[PDB]
Symmetry: C3
């Protein structure tokens, strides 16, 4: 019943008949994910024969200081286990939340993926690890608690859950669409997005540090403050829609390199793609 690890998705694509070399104190969840593969505790490693798996980020710090690590490419030959939110060169799943290329995030939103709060996360999105995404409890009852249900019997729970499924303010993200976090998004430190009231973080939206987001963010909007407010937009409204049609975040690696000057210069991006 174990969900598919981020490590499992990498090994499925890059192990290539090698043996996994565990770098660090192995854990029960790691051993569980490493069952269908040949693995051993790492000593002397070779990218021809071994794929290095550092258990903790502390273990990766140790591996990347070692001389043997210089022959190992990120993702292609090594990876960290305890980093479910780490970026990848391909489109992955987090639990069952699709996550695009070069998109990383922390543990608060990994849990938000587990809670069914997020529908999907786009490409090239940078989310600070300390960002958090939680829902609201019911606000229309005599109690605000959630774990009182542990004391509810079958009859008391049927009538509790029935009201939640009808609450139009979506407690615990009920009866609402899971939120989509677009591509080219930046989320600052200590940011919070209410999962009960937000369904869309637009493409290109920039959420400032310490911002509390209670509503949808328009595409390429910059929001700051408690509560978050639109301070500026990244580009004009004509480039905003042109961006939403050109969709550079879905290019190939060869196309990204072939349009580097357009990605580096928004003015040149317009002179190249803003055809009418």
């Amino acid at each position: 019943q174990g969900m598919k690890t981020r490590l499992e998705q990498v090994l499925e694509r890059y192990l290539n008949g090698r043996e996994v070399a565990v770098w660090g104190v192995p854990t029960r969840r790691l051993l569980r994910a490493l069952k269908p593969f040949k693995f051993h505790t790492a000593d002397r490693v070779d990218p021809q024969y071994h794929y290095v798996v550092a258990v903790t980020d502390d273990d990766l710090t140790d591996f990347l200081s070692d001389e043997q690590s210089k022959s190992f490419q990120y993702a292609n030959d090594y990876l960290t286990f305890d980093d479910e939110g780490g970026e990848l060169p391909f489109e992955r799943m987090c639990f069952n939340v699709p996550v695009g290329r070069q998109t990383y995030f922390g543990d608060g939103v990994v849990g938000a993926c587990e809670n069914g709060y997020i529908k999907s996360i786009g490409q090239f999105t940078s989310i600070n690890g300390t960002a958090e995404i939680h829902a609201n409890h019911q606000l229309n009852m005599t109690f605000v608690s959630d774990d009182i249900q542990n004391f509810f019997n079958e009859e008391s729970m049927a009538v509790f859950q029935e009201k939640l499924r009808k609450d139009p303010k979506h407690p615990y993200a009920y009866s609402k669409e899971p939120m989509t976090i677009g591509s080219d998004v930046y989320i600052g430190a200590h940011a919070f997005i209410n999962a009960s009231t937000v369904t869309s973080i637009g493409d290109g939206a920039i959420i400032g540090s310490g911002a509390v987001v209670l509503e949808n963010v328009p595409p390429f909007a910059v929001v700051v403050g408690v509560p978050a407010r639109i301070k500026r937009y990244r580009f004009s409204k004509e480039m905003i829609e042109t961006l939403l049609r050109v969709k550079w975040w879905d290019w190939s690696i060869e196309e990204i390199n072939e349009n580097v000057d357009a990605l580096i210069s928004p003015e040149l991006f317009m002179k190249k793609y803003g055809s009418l």
Copy 2:
């Protein structure tokens, strides 16, 4: 007395602890008064499974063996001092009511003597923080400078700290009482030097910085925290404080679930008249 110890004193029932995960020195110290082993084949009739990390419990509950293990009754996580429980428990020496949970920041607050008790059915976000102020009336704001103080220098340092009316390090003030039916959001902050109570039913929004007492059933948001609304009318707040549903038995909670679900039904039933 650790949280695992309080459960094992209650629900182990002569079984043997099954350690799901790599054991730590502190867990090995707590499991000393019982027999234990590394979990392989587990049966809830023979074993109480104890997951070391939250990552261990996730692996255990996804195993086909956990299908007959009940929460707290048959299993528990050791590195979850702030996890909820079906009976009133102690966090260090801070009482905590039933179905109430918090994070490690609040755990350290309990350890620092900042909290007097935490009520029933209270939901505290793990990223919530509770710290006190340093001394602000002296030439230095540092605390660890006292590590360079000798026996005579700290006699006068500690002397003025306890005289300080602003309660540096929560000095000369009652510890903080967090009521029942309380909700506190993520990244919230409560100042242990200037806050003595969070009322019953109080709701602290995410990202809110609480510097003064929150009234019962008040909804506070912002930096600093300010009251945005009250949960119920004044009359229901009076009756909610006389009834105290959070102290009901499991029986009364299930019997009056209709009153717990609808505030208006609660009002006619337990209201004054």
Copy 3:
């Protein structure tokens, strides 16, 4: 690049054996390779330097009755605590940190990213404080890891605009930030490494404050964004504090002026300018 533990063992081990309290990690064994270590059992400070692997391991040790004879730093230390205070000036990565100054893992990462030039003495930084920089905001994209798809030539142009940018994305083309002495920083506080270069001596950053520019010495900043609430002392006292620099005193001098450090009024009647 010595660790916090390596710095302490080179100075206080004194021919003893390090006794490891807890399950040893890969990075701890590597730090302990030049020393004589073994699993802790029965420990004596005349014989052993107890090393606790995790914060959770040290709590277990100090509750044990064998810890009653050990002293902090001199006789025991925690491994996973690069931001923990020390009774001497230390090096976090390659960032000088003053005596009795502590921070959390976010600021340790800020030292690793080169965002911090130095951190003063007797500075108290909450563990949930953060110091991150801005990505480029004058481009078509805000991503950083998109550069993992950049080839050799595209990387050149990208890195070129970054060093040209006057707003200092990723703290480029700007001086690393200085954090003064006798500074306090509340929980959940954030300092932008792209636009800040100095946290003045004696500054106080209140909880939840978003500091977007330099904080003067002895100013108290709060809010989102952070603005000056008050100053700890008068303008004349700040100027005397900046010349006296009590945070550079010897342990003897600190005790000899414990009355001047406790009462600001006594500090001025003794060090105030003529």
